Design a binder for this molecule. Sequence first.
Ligand SMILES: N#CC[NH+]1CCN(c2cccc(Cl)c2)CC1
Ligand SMILES: *[C@@H]1O[C@H](CO)[C@@H](O)[C@H](O)[C@H]1NC(C)=O
Length: 342
Amino acid sequence: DLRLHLLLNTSVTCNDGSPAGYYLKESRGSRRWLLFLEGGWYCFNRENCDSRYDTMRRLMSSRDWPRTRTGTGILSSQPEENPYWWNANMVFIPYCSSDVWSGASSKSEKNEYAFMGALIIQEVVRELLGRGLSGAKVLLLAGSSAGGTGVLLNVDRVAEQLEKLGYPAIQVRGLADSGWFLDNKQYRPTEAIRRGIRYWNGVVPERCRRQFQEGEEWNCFFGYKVYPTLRSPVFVVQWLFDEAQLTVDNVHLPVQEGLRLYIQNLGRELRHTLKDVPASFAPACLSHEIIIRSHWTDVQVKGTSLPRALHCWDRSLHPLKGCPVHLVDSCPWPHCNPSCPT
Ligand SMILES: N#CC[NH+]1CCN(c2cccc(Cl)c2)CC1
Ligand SMILES: *[C@@H]1O[C@H](CO)[C@@H](O)[C@H](O)[C@H]1NC(C)=O
């Protein structure tokens, strides 16, 4: 059980003006800290955000949040369930800004909603320093889906915040799960991101913004375009046949030749984009998200599990014999890897 703390700075808020927050479970014998960003889509205009507020309100407000949460997967404290980091300080940051963790805009007489994702992450980091994060050796910023994209947008800002605050010994790293998407041609969109950025006052990393320049910041929401501009170490987890990617592409699974070629091409392209990503884990499966699932230990690429690959990554940041860090399936069809989830 991680326990809820609402932010002491009550001007950093969820969409509806209620305070944002985090769930925390400390481990005082550990110098490692895991901060996990929740996912859950986004909204990009007034009518679309009003709809979300009727039927997905916990992703827009803290008024109904529970006081405790169970840590699962990489957030579990049991060695059995979490071989990687079971003894770490665990933090779950709920997603209540609907902005892919990019916003920096307050509710005002001209804004029905607040979009403060990027500022929520900064304020959580600040308040944690008073509860032991000041003694950390490693800060792993992780997240799934919208939270995985949020890792890519925010990991370098957290590193800079800690440097400027006077904590140069904390090593900031990222773990992006199921947030690596392709702006490809559909089988039968990009405009939503572009409109959302203006709606949220969204912020992207500086080096990426300088490359694409004004009006084209939407490009930095795509992993293969923003990742080359990042300085902090980032481990990328991505199913080759991600279900959210296929939903966007209007693919719904007796497959004929046109769809067969389409699906095979998608795998090859995702595969191409990871070839110069040295820390990555990409199985040939139809699925979505993994790192906080209870059975996240089951899947293997080339005989190596995801918890093992992350441990090998830790060792590399101190090639390693028998302990690989770059793991990408080569077979070209969903579930050609026998360890895919069923
Ligand atoms: N966050 C989130 C949930 N969805 C993830 C997939 N998204 C996606 C995938 C491929 C192309 C484009 Cl334009 C968008 C939409 C949002
Ligand atoms: C609270 O957060 C807001 C938004 O980031 C900021 O303007 C303000 O300085 C913060 N207040 C304090 C006391 O840190």
